[PDB]
Amino acid sequence: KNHPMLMNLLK
Amino acid sequence: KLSEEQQHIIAILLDAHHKTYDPTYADFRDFRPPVRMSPLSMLPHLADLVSYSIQKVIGFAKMIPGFRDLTSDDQIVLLKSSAIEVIMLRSNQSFTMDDMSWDCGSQDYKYDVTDVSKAGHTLELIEPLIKFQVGLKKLNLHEEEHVLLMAICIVSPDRPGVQDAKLVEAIQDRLSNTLQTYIRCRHPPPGSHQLYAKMIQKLADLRSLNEEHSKQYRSLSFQPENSMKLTPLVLEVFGN
Numbered sequence: 001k002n003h004p005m006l007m008n009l010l011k
Numbered sequence: 012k013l014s015e016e017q018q019h020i021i022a023i024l025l026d027a028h029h030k031t032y033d034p035t036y037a038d039f040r041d042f043r044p045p046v047r048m049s050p051l052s053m054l055p056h057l058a059d060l061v062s063y064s065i066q067k068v069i070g071f072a073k074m075i076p077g078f079r080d081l082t083s084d085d086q087i088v089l090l091k092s093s094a095i096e097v098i099m100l101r102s103n104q105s106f107t108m109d110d111m112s113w114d115c116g117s118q119d120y121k122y123d124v125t126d127v128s129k130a131g132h133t134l135e136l137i138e139p140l141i142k143f144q145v146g147l148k149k150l151n152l153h154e155e156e157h158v159l160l161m162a163i164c165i166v167s168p169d170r171p172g173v174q175d176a177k178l179v180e181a182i183q184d185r186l187s188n189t190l191q192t193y194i195r196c197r198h199p200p201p202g203s204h205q206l207y208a209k210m211i212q213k214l215a216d217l218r219s220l221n222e223e224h225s226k227q228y229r230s231l232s233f234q235p236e237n238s239m240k241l242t243p244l245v246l247e248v249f250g251n
């Protein structure tokens with residue numbers, strides 16, 4: 001559900 | 012017996028942990044200072060601590076054999092739900108039964124029931140959390156078993172919002188099958204006695220702790236005045 005930070009840390 | 016793949020998985024999980032869990036706790040100095048006097052005096056410090064730990068659990072998750080084959084959405088979903096549980100699990104390493112506390116290298120960074128209770132969460136959570144720590148500690152897991160459990164904990168197919176659960180499950184089964192085998196060949200009796208069932212039960216205990224943590228969070232985070240003491244990562248992961 002749009003987790004920019006979580007998304008960026010997992011990339 | 013332990014195949015080459017299984018031994019490979021264990022080597023990988025052990026290194027991932029070594030790279031994400033600092034037993035010297037040198038970074039704790041970067042967190043907002045702890046305040047033991049309580050108007051949520053420990054929230055700033057523990058909030059930063061948890062936030063930092065979320066980052067470290069993510070780093071660990073990324074190195075789980077097979078985690079990279081999941082989609083971004085599933086990866087986010089698994090970490091969002093598992094973070095708190097994995098932090099509770101990895102904390103067993105600093106938890107000592109001598110004085111029922113998390114001894115993170117020094118007085119200032121040694122948290123007990125009262126410190127951990129000075130951050131907006133009630134004994135509805137803390138009591139069960141310590142009990143968990145004690146029982147997990149009493150399983151005397153090999154470090155090998157510890158990292159496999161955290162990995163298994165993260166890649167659970169029944170987490171809320173999972174999409175390709177079949178893949179999540181396949182990935183988990185590989186870790187789960189590696190664990191069951193490791194116990195049978197590397198953990199001697201009697202400590203090995205129903206060790207797997209005991210470890211899985213702990214995963215159910217974590218689900219319970221997770222559930223309670225959520226309620227405690229919605230509560231704490233109801234007053235914008237309190238959501239202010241938290242970090243951006245914590246708000247995004249737990250609830251903003």
Ligand SMILES: C[C@H](CCC(=O)O)[C@H]1CC[C@H]2[C@@H]3CC[C@@H]4CC(=O)CC[C@]4(C)[C@H]3CC[C@]12C
Pocket residue numbers: 057058060061064098099101102103104105106113115122127128130132224
């Ligand atoms: C200091 C402990 C970790 C030690 C380690 O990583 O070795 C961490 C792991 C479990 C954490 C607790 C998880 C539940 C909540 C989360 C919060 O917002 C801070 C207050 C609570 C009550 C936490 C306090 C700090 C603890 C006890």
